[PDB]
Amino acid sequence: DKTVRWCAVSEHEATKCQSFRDHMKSVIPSDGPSVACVKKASYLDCIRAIAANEADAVTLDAGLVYDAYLAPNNLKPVVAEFYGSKEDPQTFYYAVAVVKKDSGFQMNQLRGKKSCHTGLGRSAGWNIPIGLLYCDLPEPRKPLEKAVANFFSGSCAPCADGTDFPQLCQLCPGCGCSTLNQYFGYSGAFKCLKDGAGDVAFVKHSTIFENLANKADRDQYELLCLDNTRKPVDEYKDCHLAQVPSHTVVARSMGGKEDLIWELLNQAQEHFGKDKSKEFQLFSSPHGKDLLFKDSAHGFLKVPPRMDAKMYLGYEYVTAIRNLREGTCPKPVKWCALSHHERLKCDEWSVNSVGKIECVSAETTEDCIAKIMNGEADAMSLDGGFVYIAGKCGLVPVLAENYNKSDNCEDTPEAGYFAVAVVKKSASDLTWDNLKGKKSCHTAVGRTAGWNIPMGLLYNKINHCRFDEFFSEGCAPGSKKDSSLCKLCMGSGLNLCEPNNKEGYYGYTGAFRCLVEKGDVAFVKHQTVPQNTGGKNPDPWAKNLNEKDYELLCLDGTRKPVEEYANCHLARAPNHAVVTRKDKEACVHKILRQQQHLFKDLLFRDDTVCLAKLHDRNTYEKYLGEEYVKAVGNLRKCSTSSLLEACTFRRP
Amino acid sequence: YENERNALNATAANKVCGLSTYLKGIAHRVNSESAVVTEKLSDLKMRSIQLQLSVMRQDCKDIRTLLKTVLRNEFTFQQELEEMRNASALAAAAAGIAAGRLEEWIFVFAQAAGGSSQFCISVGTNIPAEYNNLQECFDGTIGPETLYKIEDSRVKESAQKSLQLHEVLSSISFSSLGAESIVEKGENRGCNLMRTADGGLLKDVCLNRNFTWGGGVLNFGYCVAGNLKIKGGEYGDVGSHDAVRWTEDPSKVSIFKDVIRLFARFQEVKNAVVKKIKTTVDELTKCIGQKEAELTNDQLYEEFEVIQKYLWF
Amino acid sequence: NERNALNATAANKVCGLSTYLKGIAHRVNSESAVVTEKLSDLKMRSIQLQLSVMRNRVPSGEQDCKDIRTLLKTVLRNEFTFQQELEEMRNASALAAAAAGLAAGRLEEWIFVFAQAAGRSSQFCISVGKTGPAEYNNLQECFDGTIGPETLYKIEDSRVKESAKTSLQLHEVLSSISFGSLGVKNIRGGNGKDGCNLVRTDTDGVLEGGSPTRHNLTWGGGVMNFGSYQNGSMYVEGGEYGDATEYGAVRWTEDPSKVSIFKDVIRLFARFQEAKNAVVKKIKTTVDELTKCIGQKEAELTNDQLYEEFIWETINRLELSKR
Ligand SMILES: *[C@@H]1O[C@H](CO)[C@@H](O)[C@H](O)[C@H]1NC(C)=O
Numbered sequence A: 001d002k003t004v005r006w007c008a009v010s011e012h013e014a015t016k017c018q019s020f021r022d023h024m025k026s027v028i029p030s031d032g033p034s035v036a037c038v039k040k041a042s043y044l045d046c047i048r049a050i051a052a053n054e055a056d057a058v059t060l061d062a063g064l065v066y067d068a069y070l071a072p073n074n075l076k077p078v079v080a081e082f083y084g085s086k087e088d089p090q091t092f093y094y095a096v097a098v099v100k101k102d103s104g105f106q107m108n109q110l111r112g113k114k115s116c117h118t119g120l121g122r123s124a125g126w127n128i129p130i131g132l133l134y135c136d137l138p139e140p141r142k143p144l145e146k147a148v149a150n151f152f153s154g155s156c157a158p159c160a161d162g163t164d165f166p167q168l169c170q171l172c173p174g175c176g177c178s179t180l181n182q183y184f185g186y187s188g189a190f191k192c193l194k195d196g197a198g199d200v201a202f203v204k205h206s207t208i209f210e211n212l213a214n215k216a217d218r219d220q221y222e223l224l225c226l227d228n229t230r231k232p233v234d235e236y237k238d239c240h241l242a243q244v245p246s247h248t249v250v251a252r253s254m255g256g257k258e259d260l261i262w263e264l265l266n267q268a269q270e271h272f273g274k275d276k277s278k279e280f281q282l283f284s285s286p287h288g289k290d291l292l293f294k295d296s297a298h299g300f301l302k303v304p305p306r307m308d309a310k311m312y313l314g315y316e317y318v319t320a321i322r323n324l325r326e327g328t329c330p331k332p333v334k335w336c337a338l339s340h341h342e343r344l345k346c347d348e349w350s351v352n353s354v355g356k357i358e359c360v361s362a363e364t365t366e367d368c369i370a371k372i373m374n375g376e377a378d379a380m381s382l383d384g385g386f387v388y389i390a391g392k393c394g395l396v397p398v399l400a401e402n403y404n405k406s407d408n409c410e411d412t413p414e415a416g417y418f419a420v421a422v423v424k425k426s427a428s429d430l431t432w433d434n435l436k437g438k439k440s441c442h443t444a445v446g447r448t449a450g451w452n453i454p455m456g457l458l459y460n461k462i463n464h465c466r467f468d469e470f471f472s473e474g475c476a477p478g479s480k481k482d483s484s485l486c487k488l489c490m491g492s493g494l495n496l497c498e499p500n501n502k503e504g505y506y507g508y509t510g511a512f513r514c515l516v517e518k519g520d521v522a523f524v525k526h527q528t529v530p531q532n533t534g535g536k537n538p539d540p541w542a543k544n545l546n547e548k549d550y551e552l553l554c555l556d557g558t559r560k561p562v563e564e565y566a567n568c569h570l571a572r573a574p575n576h577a578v579v580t581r582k583d584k585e586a587c588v589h590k591i592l593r594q595q596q597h598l599f600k601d602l603l604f605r606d607d608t609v610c611l612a613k614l615h616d617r618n619t620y621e622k623y624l625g626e627e628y629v630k631a632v633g634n635l636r637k638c639s640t641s642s643l644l645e646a647c648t649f650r651r652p
Numbered sequence B: 001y002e003n004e005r006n007a008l009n010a011t012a013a014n015k016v017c018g019l020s021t022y023l024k025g026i027a028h029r030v031n032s033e034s035a036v037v038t039e040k041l042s043d044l045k046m047r048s049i050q051l052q053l054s055v056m057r058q059d060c061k062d063i064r065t066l067l068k069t070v071l072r073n074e075f076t077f078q079q080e081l082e083e084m085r086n087a088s089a090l091a092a093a094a095a096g097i098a099a100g101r102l103e104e105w106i107f108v109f110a111q112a113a114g115g116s117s118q119f120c121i122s123v124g125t126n127i128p129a130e131y132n133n134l135q136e137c138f139d140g141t142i143g144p145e146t147l148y149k150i151e152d153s154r155v156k157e158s159a160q161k162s163l164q165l166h167e168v169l170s171s172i173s174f175s176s177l178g179a180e181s182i183v184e185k186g187e188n189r190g191c192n193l194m195r196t197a198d199g200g201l202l203k204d205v206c207l208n209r210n211f212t213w214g215g216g217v218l219n220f221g222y223c224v225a226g227n228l229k230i231k232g233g234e235y236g237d238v239g240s241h242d243a244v245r246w247t248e249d250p251s252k253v254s255i256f257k258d259v260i261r262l263f264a265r266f267q268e269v270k271n272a273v274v275k276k277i278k279t280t281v282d283e284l285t286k287c288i289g290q291k292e293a294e295l296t297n298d299q300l301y302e303e304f305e306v307i308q309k310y311l312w313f
Numbered sequence C: 001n002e003r004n005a006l007n008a009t010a011a012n013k014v015c016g017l018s019t020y021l022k023g024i025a026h027r028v029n030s031e032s033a034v035v036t037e038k039l040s041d042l043k044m045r046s047i048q049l050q051l052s053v054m055r056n057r058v059p060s061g062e063q064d065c066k067d068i069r070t071l072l073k074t075v076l077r078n079e080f081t082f083q084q085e086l087e088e089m090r091n092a093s094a095l096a097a098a099a100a101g102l103a104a105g106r107l108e109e110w111i112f113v114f115a116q117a118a119g120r121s122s123q124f125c126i127s128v129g130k131t132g133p134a135e136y137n138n139l140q141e142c143f144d145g146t147i148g149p150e151t152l153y154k155i156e157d158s159r160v161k162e163s164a165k166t167s168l169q170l171h172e173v174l175s176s177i178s179f180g181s182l183g184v185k186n187i188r189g190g191n192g193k194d195g196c197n198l199v200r201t202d203t204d205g206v207l208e209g210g211s212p213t214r215h216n217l218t219w220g221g222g223v224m225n226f227g228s229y230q231n232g233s234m235y236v237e238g239g240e241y242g243d244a245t246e247y248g249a250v251r252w253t254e255d256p257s258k259v260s261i262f263k264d265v266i267r268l269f270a271r272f273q274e275a276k277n278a279v280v281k282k283i284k285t286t287v288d289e290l291t292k293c294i295g296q297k298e299a300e301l302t303n304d305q306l307y308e309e310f311i312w313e314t315i316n317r318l319e320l321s322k323r
């Protein structure tokens, strides 16, 4: 049926909910979504009721969103509250570490400094900083308060016992848990830093802007980043400790009425949301403050379906809380494999390297990026289009694949390969412009030469994203299985249009096979035709093919032989790079360089001569270059990546 | 962290397989122990024929009751020997059940191995335990045909190891193994067979109940996730959702209780039969004459047939 | 892809077979009791013949009774060998018991593990048609009460003892679990979303982020045979241990006599039965020779009166020589 049992943790919350149900009943028909309320003693009895299929939804702060994801509860974020303008909705806050300009210490130099905290046991003022600095704290780390007092050289942690931990009140004697304590809360924690009492303030991104209106006054302040560098207070999105969701609606991971919660809460915000009805208000009640939802909310947003608790909260938030709860404190590299073909090869690599490289399988590339992100795997080799996505997901590039013959391959950076449009010499009617209503063969959707470059140049022409309407049919592995762009694929049953080697037309060679057998245009790297023609590929289909029988489509409606690629390419493509978790650069760089010197395109492109070093280019923007990022950006409207949609919901 | 999936250590696997082949050997043990009793009984037949030869040639004076009890023994014993062999089949069968229960568990874990990184039986490396690491489980390449059969090589020599059932059971207790030698902690070997939480035995949900491998050897709560925190305890000692418990008292495990009960029973019957033969042998001896006593087994039977065929005709 | 489960009808027939195998212990015990009955009857008849010789009641010779001298020598020696054959037969009786106990433990561990693999939201590894989990109420051949280690049938339970009392033979009971008798629809069950990983060898099934590519996982001793990348859809075809492929169907046994664990039970129980029958034939043919030369007076003599009158006669025949 269509009822959502909402969990109320008090008497006043339970009556606002009876009013919520009754007001909904008055504006939604019998068939539609309905609320029903369930009363519980605490938020933990709520998380428990949902998990035990008694209730369906409850709104929670980040700390509780963590406890609800753990087993045996296994709940997940489904809907979020937003604050401020519809243009820039403020779903998340940024926990920052504010300092004074030129005090000259980094995150790794906090020991011996004077700290200012919002309060003991508060999220950005205590839980996040102390959770991350956990292993920098002296032994014995228990009680935590003793360890914090022996780390800093004087603090102000309001709501802490000054009788037991006097160093924690040195800056605000008494550790007063009210606004009567000048250094209490965000304004006080900032005041503690402003008055020169402390050297660091654990606050939110907003605090400085709420306390200093003058940009010249704020200029005398900086933030501490985790990379052990400082940045201006207005660069908080690029320099923070954690990115934390404000208030989130949670439901069961399996059989939780996710779409029925969304329907009800979207309908609710349209009738009784911010400045809508004189009758009922969703974000206000006479019976109390922050009942069911925060009063400050402007409404709701759907959480992308790919989003899981760990990802939603972020690696930083999860890492800090794990350290606080667990207390657990101190190679080899887990390589992600793309289906059974890559895994077969990865297995030989695992035993031969004798426990230097380990393996994990995933059916898609974005599933693998997601394994890297959380920790299920550590690294994998990606194409340019997937470096953009993987990077936007927080991951970084560590080694670049080099393809040119060089003296010192390892330290000679390359400009990239070339994206080309391959036709048969026989189909002489074909011109770059004469492609409408014809058959295409893509490596996979989201790939540089196969997708992002030709579909970007097509989008700049037809000014629409229906590429399946433009072509008659084709094979672009990764597309919707009911699209015309999956009709020319060769995959067996479910394996049809799959973005792995189970699909016979996936990849550079696969797209070339597509052109020979079914298609009339293939989108690949400049060296695909030579690598398969003239016997070089022993496979039945390729064995007797010669490169003299294939041509290239030039942007000026011209055709040239495959060898004349230099002046008949769609665009230059950034080289495939090995991406990893920021906190793994060093080890991967070390073991891959070590490994590389010791030892289809399985794991790496078969034309890789070696893995080359990166310098100041340790970011996707820096690695791919200003030009490629701009071209991928122009295709955001046409995106189908459920992972990109999720990652940009946190960092647009 | 929570997605962490530990593997059973090979030394804990071999120790279970060791017990499993001791239990297969119980059939050979009851057969051998029953062969002793027949030796003791044949000595009674050789001593009664020794008496009949004296009879057909003090306080032994009553000839009637000597031969009435002798004919009685010929029947009274075989119906009590029937009773001991009946107990031997049950002790041999009940033992074989416990052997199979432990075998399926370890064998399934041994087969759930995949090239590198993910497997259920570990040796510390990123390579699953192979037949050479599982020497007490398999006699070559891992498979159904390489597991030890009851007539097999080591089952027979296990049956003569002078080890007692109570000692071999102790060998797989939590103390005897040690907390760090049972499971490989702090490692993600992807073995879903040791996970009751969602993404384990079931892909999206915790179990509705506790779970056990063996019949109470390895025990899990309804929602075990991450680093396995093994403690000593039994199937009943799983209180929380997180609980992992390896047997501290193997004689409290379901499948072993019947092996103890029924082997003790056979021994109880075997000992009762043994004493009966001893008390009979001792009372027949005081009637046998020295001429017939010093007589060798071969000629003793030749002489009986002589007086036997004399009296018939 | 559909996510199906092992069906309760397959599980129950597999459990039925396991309780039959536990009952083999009782079958060999009853069968041996029939032989000791036959041998005790043979021992009685030879005293009756000995009495007839002493009392000169042995017939003049209808059949060849004129050579009681030799036909008694051979009977008293055959009686001695039969005692050694009984012991050899009982040794086989314990090995048949153990071997069957093994096969049963293997099957019981298999099914029990699937029975326990059950949770909320219709997620289970044993179905009751297109639903589940199967509870102890279903699966009554497996369990005595709510699913657990103490509700599995033990060797002395009435169910085991009563299954040993039937006229059912090993081959009939083995065939009950073959792909032929069962059929696809009695093996695969559930809704298309019961999340059973024990039945998926593809990635995230038995192994997380991997598949058992080194070994073709088999449950039973080769009853249910997996390859390396099985869906979890429970697509089944008939076949044996070496038949499973990487992407193909699960192979369910076509011939249960070809499974590792049943091969020994058939072999060892056959050895018992052959040994038993051979002793019974020999006892019969010797008793055929005895009942001929006894005489109604000595034939009617039974139980306690047989020993009484025999000792009465041996003491008289000894005083006949002594006087
Ligand atoms: C790199 O590749 C281009 C391809 O045309 C070639 O001209 C150039 O000489 C190569 N560089 C080296 C150092 O080989």
Ligand SMILES: [Fe+3]
Pocket: A383, A384, A447, A448, A449, A450, A573
């Ligand atoms: Fe590419």
